[PDB]
Amino acid sequence: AKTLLHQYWDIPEGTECHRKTYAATSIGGASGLVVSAYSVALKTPTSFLEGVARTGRYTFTAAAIGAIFGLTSCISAQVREKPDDPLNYLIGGCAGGLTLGARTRSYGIGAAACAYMGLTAALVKMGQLEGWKVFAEPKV
């Protein structure tokens, strides 16, 4: 929901930790529940026990992505103390990508996940810090 992604933006950046990380786990678990709902509605896992198992795997992996991302974001922000550069979240996206590779137990997909997630997360912080509006003006 927009209210708790706004809660994730509500923490100063800055550090108010355990709370930024819990918001990251909540966002990741919500996205994992979404993707698990799609993957259980488009497959017929046959049967309900395997459906619970697949939803548990997708939710736990996406929440662990959120957790590890929030951890390395919190630690990098405490150490280097720079809210200007998105290099902290570049490190964060690569750490999430390497742990996604660990949870899929491959290496090439993990390295590509480091690259793509790190660049997109640095882009997210970079465009938020300079200010690029979400989806619209909607004026002219």
Partner 1 sequence: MNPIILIIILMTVMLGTIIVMISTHWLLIWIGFEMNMLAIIPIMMKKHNPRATEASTKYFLTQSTASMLLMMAIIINLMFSGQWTVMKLFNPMASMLMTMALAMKLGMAPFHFWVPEVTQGIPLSSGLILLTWQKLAPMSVLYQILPSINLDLILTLSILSITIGGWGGLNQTQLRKIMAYSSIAHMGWMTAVLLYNPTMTLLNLIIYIIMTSTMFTLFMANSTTTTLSLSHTWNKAPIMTILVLITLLSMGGLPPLSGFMPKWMIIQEMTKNDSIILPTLMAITALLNLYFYMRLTYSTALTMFPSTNNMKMKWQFPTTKRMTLLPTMTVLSTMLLPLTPILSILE
Partner 2 sequence: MLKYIIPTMMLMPLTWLSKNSMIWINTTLHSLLISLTSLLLLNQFGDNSLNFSLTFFSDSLSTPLLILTMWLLPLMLMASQHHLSKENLARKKLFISMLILLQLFLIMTFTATELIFFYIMFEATLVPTLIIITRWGNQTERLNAGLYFLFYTLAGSLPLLVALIYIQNTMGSLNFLILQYWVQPMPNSWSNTFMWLACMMAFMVKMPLYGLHLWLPKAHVEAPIAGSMVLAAILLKLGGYGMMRITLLLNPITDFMAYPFIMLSLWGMIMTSSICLRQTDLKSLIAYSSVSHMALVIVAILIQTPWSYMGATALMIAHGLTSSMLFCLANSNYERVHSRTMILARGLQTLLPLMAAWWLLASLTNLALPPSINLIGELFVVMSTFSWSNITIILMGLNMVITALYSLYMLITTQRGKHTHHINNILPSFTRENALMSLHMLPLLLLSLNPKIILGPLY
Ligand X SMILES: CCCCCCCCCCCCCCCCCC(=O)OC[C@H](COP(=O)([O-])OCC[N+](C)(C)C)OC(=O)CCCCCCCCCCCCCCCCC
Of 102, 92, 94, residue with least CA distance to 72? 92
- The least distance separating ligand X from the CB of residue 132, rounded to whole angstroms, comes to 5
d(CA 91, CA 28): 18
d(CA 9, CA 127): 13
- State yes or no: cis peptide before 97, omega within 30 of 0: no
Applying CB under 6 A, does 132 fall inside the site for ligand X?
A: yes
- The least distance separating partner 2 from the CB of residue 130, rounded to whole angstroms, comes to 5
Q: Cα torsion for 96, 100, 106, 111, to the nearest 10°?
A: -30
Element at 40 (helix H, strand E): helix 19-41
Tell me the angle at which helices 19-41 and 48-80 cross, rounded to the nearest 10 degrees: 150
- Stretch of 2-10, 51-59, 61-69, 121-129 lying at the interface with partner 2 (CB under 8 A): 121-129
Count of residues in contact with ligand X, rule CB under 6 A: 3
Applying CB under 8 A, does 111 fall inside the site for partner 2?
A: no
Looking at beta carbons only, is 49 or 140 nearer to partner 1? 140
- The least distance separating partner 2 from the CB of residue 140, rounded to whole angstroms, comes to 11
Applying CB under 8 A, does 127 fall inside the site for partner 1?
A: yes
Which residue is listed with tokens 């990098």? Answer: 76
Residues contributing to the site for partner 1 (CB under 8 A): 127, 132-133, 135-140
Residues contributing to the site for ligand X (CB under 6 A): 123, 131-132
Residues contributing to the site for partner 2 (CB under 8 A): 126-127, 129-130, 132
